[PDB]
Write a protein that binds this ligand. Structure first.
Ligand SMILES: *[C@@H]1O[C@H](CO)[C@@H](O)[C@H](O)[C@H]1NC(C)=O
Ligand SMILES: *[C@@H]1O[C@H](CO)[C@@H](O)[C@H](O)[C@H]1NC(C)=O
Ligand SMILES: *[C@@H]1O[C@H](CO)[C@@H](O)[C@H](O)[C@H]1NC(C)=O
Ligand SMILES: *[C@@H]1O[C@H](CO)[C@@H](O)[C@H](O)[C@H]1NC(C)=O
Length: 244
């Protein structure tokens, strides 16, 4: 959770002069949050929360200085606030909060001196999220298209397409019985960082399976370690089903 730009924004409308800026975190109607995408001057692409709500005034003489817009990231408890500062119906919009893929947010509006709604951002498999800067940093553009072939002597041959980075990969084999989810075997295979010559080429690893009847469901997972996502890159898997 962050602001796209931190300078004060002009939010003025006919009959209402308005400024909005980040503030220290201290009635609104029709609070709505849409997912939008912002392209930056630096050439990046971020998912943003497009937040809107209505201020309805009546004949009532009232002291109204502004509004506080609060966004809480539920996984980290990161909270950011912006304060609207004033001078029948006015619709307010704020689209400068950058959000993270696959995260839930709680949005709150308070008139100063309330309404709360939650917002869930789709993961990096969503076609529009896939091309954002955060998703591409998680390796969203790489498609290994992992395939696992059963070999004659209780071995598997795993094939996968490498990306274009000189970083290592790991293949994690976890074996299971047909239905029970307690593993009967586990093995990690280190794939050395490829040379630029093997970039975008399809490589393979041969895995040796545990010789145990019933230990027949083999999950094979590839984890890349691209410099932009370290231990947090998107992973892919294929599973060999039991021939039972
Ligand atoms: C990925 O694997 C599937 C296997 O059925 C195949 O249809 C598809 O064409 C493969 N993709 C590429 C890029 O070769
Ligand atoms: C990696 O491959 C993609 C293929 O679309 C390309 O856009 C990108 O520029 C390549 N990155 C590097 C560092 O060569
Ligand atoms: C066992 O693993 C499968 C994985 O697809 C899952 O659907 C199922 O709910 C799991 N069951 C238990 C008891 O963990
Ligand atoms: C498996 O991959 C290695 C490169 O990592 C290659 O030398 C070998 O020939 C490939 N094996 C098969 C069966 O294609």
């Amino acid at each position: 959770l962050r602001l796209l730009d931190h300078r004060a924004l002009v939010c003025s409308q006919p009959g209402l002069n308005c400024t909005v800026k980040n503030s220290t975190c201290l009635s609104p109607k029709d609070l709505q949050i849409q997912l939008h995408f912002a392209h930056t001057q630096q050439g990046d692409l971020f998912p943003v929360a497009h937040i809107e709500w209505t201020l309805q005034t009546d004949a009532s003489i009232l002291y109204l200085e502004g509004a506080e817009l609060s966004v809480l990231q539920l996984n980290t408890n990161e909270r950011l606030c912006v304060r609207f500062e004033f001078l029948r119906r006015w619709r307010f919009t704020f689209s400068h909060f950058v959000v993270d893929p696959d995260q839930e947010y709680e949005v709150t509006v308070h008139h100063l001196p309330h309404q709360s709604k939650n917002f869930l951002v789709p993961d990096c498999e969503h076609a529009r999220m896939k091309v954002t800067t955060p998703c591409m940093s998680s390796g969203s553009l790489w498609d290994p298209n992992i395939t696992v072939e059963t070999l004659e002597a209780h071995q598997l041959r795993v094939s996968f397409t490498l990306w274009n980075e000189s970083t290592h990969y790991q293949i994690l084999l976890t074996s299971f019985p047909h239905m029970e989810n307690h593993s009967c075997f586990e093995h990690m295979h280190h794939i050395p960082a490829p040379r630029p010559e093997e970039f975008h080429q399809r490589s393979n690893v041969t895995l040796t399976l545990r010789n145990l009847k019933g230990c027949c469901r083999h999950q094979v997972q590839i984890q890349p370690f691209f410099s932009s996502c370290l231990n947090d890159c998107l992973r892919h898997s294929a599973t060999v089903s039991c021939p039972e």
